[PDB]
């Protein structure tokens, strides 16, 4: 439903321009994020347009971004300006649950969210995710979004708005607040679940990522008797 276009490669201290093609099943008032992930590092927001057109950035990197839409080309728009090899990432646009494939760029010639760095269990049973703010407890106001990515790259969300679960999202995936804590119960996990977990929290006018949770599922298949 979502596609970015890039350029592969942009030249030091020059403008990177990416394109978000959406197509599809749509309900209003989500707005477009930008999102970038560097080569062994985590996950960083750009920012964000909303459908009324008003813009949210990462205020670290507000002076360098433009974010702009064309909705008779369904499109949205993301330029950054000044690149330096730091800028080399896999750059993602996400609408709610819906993330694009990415594409890489590379350079050639706050508040804090913490989240178990990693879990195991066994297939049929029951695990628990957790997010924390530093700011205090988690609150429905931080509307706690929670996003999959298996092998290859492959971002989905799987709950926004702390427990509205995606279309298509397996009925086992489930949010809710727990104690001072966002949590993503994974009810009769399954060997597909295996994967990294990210949870993001909103604060006012931003999205700040946790570090994500690497889920191991351990078990092998046995004989089954009818």
């Known amino acids: 439903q979502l596609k970015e276009s890039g350029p592969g490669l942009v030249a030091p201290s020059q403008s990177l321009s990416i394109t978000c093609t959406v197509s599809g099943l749509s309900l209003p008032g989500y707005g477009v994020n930008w999102v970038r992930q560097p080569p062994g590092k985590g996950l960083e927001w750009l920012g964000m347009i909303w459908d009324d057109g008003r813009t949210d950035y990462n205020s670290a990197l507000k002076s360098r971004l433009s974010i702009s839409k064309d909705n008779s080309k369904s499109q949205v728009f993301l330029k950054m300006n000044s690149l330096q090899t730091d800028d080399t990432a896999r750059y993602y646009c996400?609408?709610?649950?819906?993330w694009g494939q990415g594409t890489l760029v590379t350079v050639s010639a706050q508040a804090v969210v913490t989240q178990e760095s990693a879990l195991t269990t066994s297939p049929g049973e029951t695990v628990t995710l957790t997010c924390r703010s530093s700011?205090?407890?988690?609150?429905?106001?931080?509307?706690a979004n929670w996003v999959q990515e298996k092998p290859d790259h492959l971002f989905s969300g799987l709950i926004s708005?702390?427990?509205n679960r995606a279309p298509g999202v397996p009925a086992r995936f489930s949010g809710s607040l727990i104690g001072d804590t966002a949590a993503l119960t994974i009810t009769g996990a399954q060997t597909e679940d295996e994967a990294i977990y990210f949870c993001a929290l909103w604060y006012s006018n931003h999205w700040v990522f946790g570090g994500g949770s690497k889920l191991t599922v351990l078990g092998s298949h046995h004989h089954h008797h009818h």
């Open positions: 996400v609408r709610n649950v819906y």
């Open positions: 700011t205090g407890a988690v609150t429905t106001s931080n509307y």
């Open positions: 708005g702390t427990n």
